Amino acid sequence: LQKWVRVYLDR
Amino acid sequence: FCEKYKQTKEQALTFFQEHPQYMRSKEDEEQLMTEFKKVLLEPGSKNLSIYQTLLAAHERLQA
C-alpha cells in the first residue's frame, strides 16, 4: 500500500 | 498530515479489496502503477481522491 500512498501524495 | 495519510491508506485498501487481482499479481500491479502515474501527470490530478485516481487508472487498463 505504501508505494501507492507515497506516489499519490507527490502528484 | 498524519491523519490525512491514514485516511488515504484506508481508501487505497478498500479499492484493493474491490480489485483483489492487483495484490495477487506483480504484472497487474505494474500495469496499474504505470497508468496511476499517467493519471497523476494530468492537470488537476490534485483534485482527485486516491480512490478516484486508482479507479481512473484501472479504467484506463479496461480500455
Report the gap between the CA of A6 and the closest CA in chain B (Å). Answer: 9
User: Is some CB atom of chain A closer than 8 A to the CB atom of B22?
Assistant: no
- Gyration radius from chain A CA atoms: 5
**How many contacts does A have with B, using Cβ atoms within 8 A?**
31
Give the CA distances from residue B44 to residues B10, B39, B41, in Å, rounded to whole numbers and listed in that order: 23, 10, 9
Resolution (angstroms) equals 1.9
Residue B52 DSSP label: H
Cell numbers standing for residue A4: 501507492
Long-range (24+ apart) CB contacts under 8 A made by B23-32 are B31/B61, B32/B57, B32/B58, B32/B61
- Indicate the domain borders of chain B: 2-62
Method of determination is: X-ray
Contact A7 B33 (CB under 8 A): yes
What is the spatial distance between Cα B10 and Cα B17, in angstroms, rounded to a whole number?
A: 11
Burial of B43 (0-12, 13-18, 19+ CB in 10 A): exposed
Q: Is the dihedral of CA B26, B55, B38, B62 positive or negative?
A: positive
User: Is some CB atom of chain B closer than 8 A to the CB atom of A6?
Assistant: no
